[PDB]
């Protein structure tokens, strides 16, 4: 509730957007990745195995 | 109620979409494999509890 | 959470570079998904066997 208050008002920022391009991913958008990539090491460990 | 849509808003959902498919692709090829593990460990197991 | 992050102009240099990842895994996918494949019908040839 209280990331979504914060990510709320920070979008109401007109200097915010200029930083924009050079974002990180967001921890959702890369845990994502970081299953993913867990996830393919392991169906290919599994394969061997 | 106001907003266009800009060209890096479909790009950025044809990437998460991406990774959707392949997040969906990955659990079912680890079940696929978990499916036949749990078919390699109990074809072990002889179902007869009377011998000694 | 997922709307507060929609509204973003631009594409920043890490989701750029992540859909270069997830452009890559596919091809990788397309051959663990012939080497599970390739596993079973090992498996298969071995029971009946």
Same mark, same amino acid.
């Given at each position: 509730? =209280? =990331?979504?208050?914060? *990510?709320? =008002? ?6 915010? @957007?200029? @930083?924009?391009? #050079?974002?990180? @991913?967001?921890?959702?958008? =890369?845990?994502?990745? *970081?299953?993913?990539?867990? @996830?393919?090491?392991?169906? #290919?460990?599994?394969? *061997?195995? | ?7 890096? &808003? ?12 392949? &997040? ?23 179902? &007869?509890?009377? &011998?000694? | $959470? ?5 509204? $973003? +102009? !631009? ?14 895994? +596919? ?11 390739? !596993? ?10």
């Amino acid at each position: 509730v =209280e =990331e979504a208050r914060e *990510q709320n =008002e920070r979008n109401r920022d007109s200097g915010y @957007l200029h @930083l924009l391009y #050079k974002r990180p @991913l967001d921890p959702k958008s =890369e845990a994502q990745l *970081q299953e993913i990539r867990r @996830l393919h090491q392991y169906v #290919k460990f599994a394969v *061997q195995d | 109620g106001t907003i266009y849509l800009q060209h890096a &808003d479909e790009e950025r959902e044809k990437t998460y979409k991406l990774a959707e498919n392949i &997040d969906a692709q990955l659990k079912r090829m680890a079940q696929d494999l978990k499916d036949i593990i749990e078919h390699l460990n109990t074809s072990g197991a002889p179902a &007869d509890t009377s &011998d000694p | $959470l997922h709307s507060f992050h929609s509204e $973003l +102009p !631009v594409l920043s240099d890490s989701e750029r570079d992540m859909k270069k990842e997830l452009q890559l895994i +596919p091809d990788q996918l397309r051959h663990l998904g012939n080497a599970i494949k390739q !596993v079973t019908m090992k498996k298969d040839y071995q029971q009946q066997k």
